[PDB]
């Protein structure tokens, strides 16, 4: 090796031989604190990323007449107002392979973890024609998040791009982490792109993924806040181009964006710098086009293409809890329904803070399994009745038995819903948990003990009645033998819980 | 360097200067202006280039006073992005944004200068040991624990707290942390900064006798400065901390107050700079600039820079972009609320909204987590019963919910602290209480076991035993 190190150099220096192509090249008029209004790049395709003389890669978005106004994908300190900047035949692609599994990357698809260097001889163009209607299919198979709230009331099927909206600090990153952590027994490649979150929170999330072991299959496309506006703009597109490759090669994926508020805010920055006319809330003209172009490539394909599915799950941080602002109403018009985390429900102990109300899903019971199609009906109906009767709870003074028992079962139902941090509940266990909550086999216990009793019941059942696992995991229906097995198991567990 | 300037236009603080075509400084490259003062020739006002306009002229915001500059003055560029003297020299001295001493003692040495605007630390080396801190405040040590080696946000309205709270926190921790302290007066009123300087030189932190013995190094770019200085005082404090985290390898605790000024000055210069206006009126590059400050503060495997920014939520606009992008960067946010200072409960930290990434049970303790959960749920119940209390009479709600309302009242009074630095406003002496004593106090308070004391016996009280004694004193002076 002692001189084989330079004998390796001989390979390249004798291989490459300089065909004399034409590089589109122009001077730099103006470097505008994140934008570089270079001049003269004539036949440069809109989006064809430019390369300066100091190696500062940047995309050429704004193609004006006398000055192609490019934006910089790195720091722009060293541009020197006249340095000949050369176009590059790349049209903003990223390399992509299954070797990207586990390593956290920037939007350049360059690993920022450190623990290797990904090789990838398959390149996917970042912005791409999304799956058309000939390709897309209806949502068949569900995607368990591990949450009784967002897996019984309102499903998330593979292909349906549900939306995690809510007040800041409510659990959006927590519900996303719960989904990616549950998605271990399954096969999904849970690409988690983080846009404008601080570096330290992404370190916490990546080490949480590592501690729970889910980091084997989840490309965490990290983008720190001090990354320039272009890279925070490009991160969702980068993760979309990775999950798109994995979806096209038959593998069900799940891309979880982080803070589309922050992503469209970075686009707002780069476009207001690039002198594009602003609309509502000073967001530029194509915010809705932007969010759709990256969020409408989240589809479940057909057998003609491979049956794989990208199943988005964006996160939109809305302040003061409003649906009215520009970006949340845009993303709510795009996404197939949404969910609603709320700060007051969160500080009222209910975790996850799923709003039992407005959080509708456009798919409905077409996603869930037959066991859920059975039991979630009663759960949804009883939560509807309890939420209507919620005002009567503090004033129920010896009212009739129907109202009293229904309201008491609702008061137990919300405690059934609230589940601990980062606790993944696979489909079988939450099925029996919902059944226990809805058909009354926990009415004798008070409000507090529902949680402890249900955790102990899930432990006892999943460890001592493995036939329930066979039935639910295998036959995927809540048939009478499973119903009787669960009834007897719950009864014996209530006896041993009276024995305490 | 040597590139003579010939300043073309001076439009407010933003001045743009037309260098020769070949020799042109880079972005964020300092420009010392060889100019005359109002009286007397020698006067060097520093300008940092913001962008190049392409007519051979660059736009440069002026760090010092803008008046007196003429069109056509010779200026030269340093070639280095505004080097600031730091290290073993910067201790004890109130520092200007330019890199100068302000406290009229001897000038510092420049043997350990450093560029102010540098690259952010890479994710490859990032030290994250999740650990709690015992600051001293009852509520913020219980309800929203603070992550040492991490960032902390003292959000609030205009005058709710966040500076008396910062003074109390520094009075606590300046002796506790063996690492140095750095105070960045980003756009805070000059008299409060001088109060802080007097308090530091009295409390031994400065130790004016041997100025190399201070545990602190101040940086003041306070209110009476052109918007250049408030655009870079935060980065001056950051450069001092980054030196204390690169070289001395010690956990430096930096304080920035009114970090919102680091966005307001950016707005006031961006509007002039030709950059179009963003939402409600700040700069377009709000997110990138705010991140360029608040990302350099990370524990980076040689030390841990714990920082406490006191964001200024303008007019209690919790949705305003200048705090809305800081809520993303800040670990242990503490949203102080004017509505809770209305009834006198100081500090007026919201028990609900003041939340932390350190209220996870494996990080804080299961008992701590369960008591914080019960306190926050009780306060949420009180906020949801506020409307029923407000209109339909206090008694017409439920009787168990009346127990919850009395418990919530006792809690939201008990989480008031008599500070040492706020002894002048309360009249009562300051009381310091650790996390354990207030934990045991909240247990017995919310547990309904001592739900018989009077309410004012819990308000402005250091501890639970102090509350029990105050109930005795109050019931005695009631009849007597």
């Amino acid at each position: 090796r002692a001189d084989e190190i330079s004998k390796i150099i001989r390979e390249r220096i004798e291989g490459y031989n300089r065909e004399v192509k034409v590089v589109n090249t122009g001077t730099v008029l103006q470097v505008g604190d994140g934008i570089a209004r270079i001049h003269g790049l004539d036949e440069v395709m809109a989006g064809e990323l430019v390369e300066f003389e100091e190696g500062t890669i940047g995309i050429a978005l704004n193609l004006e007449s006398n000055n192609v106004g490019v934006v910089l994908m790195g720091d722009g300190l060293m541009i020197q107002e006249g340095s000949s900047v050369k176009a590059t035949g790349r049209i903003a692609q990223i390399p992509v392979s299954e070797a990207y599994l586990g390593r956290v990357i920037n939007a350049l698809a360059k690993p920022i973890d450190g623990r290797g260097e990904i090789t990838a001889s398959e390149s996917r163009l970042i912005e791409s024609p999304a799956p058309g209607i000939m390709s897309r299919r209806s949502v068949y198979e569900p995607l368990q998040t591990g949450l009784i709230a967002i897996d019984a009331m309102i499903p998330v099927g593979r292909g349906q791009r549900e939306l995690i909206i809510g007040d800041r600090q409510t659990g959006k990153t927590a519900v996303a982490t719960d989904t990616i952590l549950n998605q271990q027994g399954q096969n999904v490649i849970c690409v988690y792109v983080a846009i404008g979150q601080k570096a330290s929170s992404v370190a916490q999330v990546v080490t949480n993924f590592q501690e729970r072991g889910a980091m084997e299959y989840t490309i965490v496309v990290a983008e720190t806040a001090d990354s320039p506006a272009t890279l925070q703009y490009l991160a969702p597109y980068t993760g979309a181009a990775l999950a798109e490759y994995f979806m096209y090669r038959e593998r069900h994926t799940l891309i979880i964006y982080d803070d589309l508020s922050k992503q469209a805010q970075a686009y707002r920055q780069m476009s207001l710098l690039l002198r594009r006319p602003p609309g509502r809330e000073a967001y530029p003209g194509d915010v809705f086009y932007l969010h759709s172009r990256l969020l409408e490539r989240a589809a479940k394909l057909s057998s003609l293409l491979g049956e794989g599915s990208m199943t988005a799950l964006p996160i939109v941080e809305t302040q003061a809890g409003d649906v009215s602002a520009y970006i949340p109403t845009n993303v709510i018009s795009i996404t197939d329904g949404q969910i609603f985390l709320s700060a007051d429900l969160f500080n009222a102990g209910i975790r996850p803070a799923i709003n039992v109300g407005i959080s509708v899903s456009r798919v409905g019971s077409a996603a869930q399994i037959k066991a859920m199609k059975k039991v979630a009906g009663k759960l949804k109906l009883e939560l509807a009745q309890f939420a209507e009767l919620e005002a009567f709870a503090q004033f129920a003074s010896d009212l009739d038995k129907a109202t009293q028992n229904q309201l008491a079962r609702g008061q137990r139902l919300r405690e059934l819903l609230k589940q601990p941090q980062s606790a993944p509940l696979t489909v079988e266990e939450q099925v029996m948990t919902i059944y226990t909550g809805t058909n009354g086999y926990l009415d004798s216990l008070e409000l507090d003990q529902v949680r402890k009793y249900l955790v102990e019941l899930r432990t006892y059942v999943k460890t001592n009645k493995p036939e329930f696992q066979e039935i639910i995991s295998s036959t995927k229906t809540f048939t009478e033998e499973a119903e009787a097995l669960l009834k007897e198991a719950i009864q014996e567990q209530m006896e041993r819980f009276l024995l305490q | 360097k040597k590139n003579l300037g010939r300043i073309a236009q001076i439009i407010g603080p933003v001045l743009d200067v037309a260098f020769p075509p070949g020799k042109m400084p880079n972005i964020y490259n300092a420009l010392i202006v060889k100019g005359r003062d109002t009286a007397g020739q020698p006067m060097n006002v520093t300008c940092e280039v913001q962008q190049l306009l392409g007519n051979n002229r660059v736009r440069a915001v002026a760090m010092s006073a803008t008046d007196g500059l003429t069109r056509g003055m010779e200026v030269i560029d340093t070639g280095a992005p505004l080097s600031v003297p730091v290290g073993g020299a910067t201790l004890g001295r109130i520092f200007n944004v330019l890199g100068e001493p302000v406290d009229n003692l001897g000038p510092v040495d420049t043997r350990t200068t450093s560029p102010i605007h540098r690259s952010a630390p890479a994710f490859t080396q990032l030290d994250t040991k999740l650990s709690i801190f015992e600051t001293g405040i009852k509520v913020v040590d219980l309800l929203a624990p603070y992550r040492r080696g991490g960032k902390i946000g003292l959000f609030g309205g205009a005058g709710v707290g966040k500076t008396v709270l910062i003074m109390e926190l520094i009075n606590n921790i300046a002796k506790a942390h063996g690492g140095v302290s750095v105070f960045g007066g980003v756009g805070e009123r000059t008299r409060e900064g001088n109060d802080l300087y007097m308090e530091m030189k009295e409390s031994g932190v400065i130790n004016e006798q041997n100025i190399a013995e201070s545990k602190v190094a101040l940086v003041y770019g306070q209110m009476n400065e052109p918007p250049g200085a408030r655009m870079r005082v935060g980065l001056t404090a950051l450069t001092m901390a980054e030196y204390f985290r690169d070289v001395n390898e010690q956990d430096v605790l930096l304080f920035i107050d009114n970090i919102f000024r680091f966005v307001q000055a950016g707005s006031e210069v961006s509007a002039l700079l030709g950059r179009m206006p963003s939402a409600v009126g700040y700069q377009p590059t709000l997110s990138t600039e705010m991140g360029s400050l608040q990302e350099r503060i990370t524990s980076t495997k040689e030390g841990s820079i714990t920082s406490i920014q006191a964001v200024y939520v303008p007019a209690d606009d919790l949705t305003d972009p200048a705090p809305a992008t800081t809520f993303a960067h800040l670990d242990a946010t503490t949203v102080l609320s004017r509505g809770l200072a209305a009834k006198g409960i100081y500090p007026a930290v919201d028990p609900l909204d003041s939340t932390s990434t350190m209220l996870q049970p494996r990080i804080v303790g299961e008992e701590h987590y369960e008591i914080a959960q019960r306190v926050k749920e009780t306060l949420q119940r009180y906020k949801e019963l506020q409307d029923i209390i407000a209109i339909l009479g206090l008694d017409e709600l439920s009787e168990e919910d009346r127990l919850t309302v009395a418990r919530a009242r006792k809690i939201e009074r008990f989480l008031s602290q008599p500070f040492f630095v706020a002894e002048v406003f309360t009249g009562s002496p300051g009381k310091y209480v650790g996390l354990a004593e207030t934990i045991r106090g909240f247990q017995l308070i919310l547990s309904g076991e001592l739900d018989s004391l009077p309410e004012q016996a819990f308000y402005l009280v250091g501890n639970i035993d102090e509350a029990t004694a105050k109930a005795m004193n109050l019931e005695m002076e009631s009849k007597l």
Binding site: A320, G321, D322 | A315, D317, L318, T319
Partner: peptide, 12 residues
Amino acid sequence: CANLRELRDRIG
């Protein structure tokens, strides 16, 4: 937003 937010509070 301290103007719209107050009215949202009163509506709720």
